[PDB]
């Protein structure tokens, strides 16, 4: 589930 980043943090 939701294993990804779009906006770097």
């Amino acid at each position, epitope marked *: 589930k939701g*294993n*990804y980043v*779009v*906006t*770097s943090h």
Partner: antibody
Amino acid sequence: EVQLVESGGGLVQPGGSLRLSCVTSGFTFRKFGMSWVRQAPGKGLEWVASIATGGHTTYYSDSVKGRFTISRDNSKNTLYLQMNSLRAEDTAVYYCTRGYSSTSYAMDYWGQGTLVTVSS
Amino acid sequence: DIVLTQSPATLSLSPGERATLSCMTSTDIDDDMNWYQQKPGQAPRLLISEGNTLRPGVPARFSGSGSGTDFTLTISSLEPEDFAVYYCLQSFNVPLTFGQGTKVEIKR
């Protein structure tokens, strides 16, 4: 308004390399995730790679992992795809695309595509 | 990888009829389904994003429903410009995966 313009495609021999570029306009590029999606002739859509706003975090399809590298230059509104060790089955129209939200790579805007043909 | 199964692969209908397009997933993807339209020679267009959200500018006759494993795109009454290919896309996880497409074609 929003424009995504691909370039760098063309004919290449198996084993060869190409580098695609996509230059964007009409939005603050560095605030958006970006992806490449391809479509082989007569076939459906296939996601290739994605990159986060900062340009460090990247994702790849298993078909291209280790051969393709996605990167971006936020000072030039530009997305790249470095394509190495190309194979016939990589032949497709490659589209530059924008993730529609700060948390999703689902694509809203698409370029016109650039054709890549791999053949001996 | 999550598999999206679109059916029917071809939907044969006339202008004015209701179009129902199905997309089923190999695992529960909550509501992270997206629907695209594509015409010949053209780049795809996003119709519906995550949460069955209708995109600004897209006609009201398009609507998405369902969540979990079974998703539907409905075109309430087909216009001539709606005969085209439609793809579903899950954005729940990487790798991002698409269905193989449904062609809405003209019945005669």
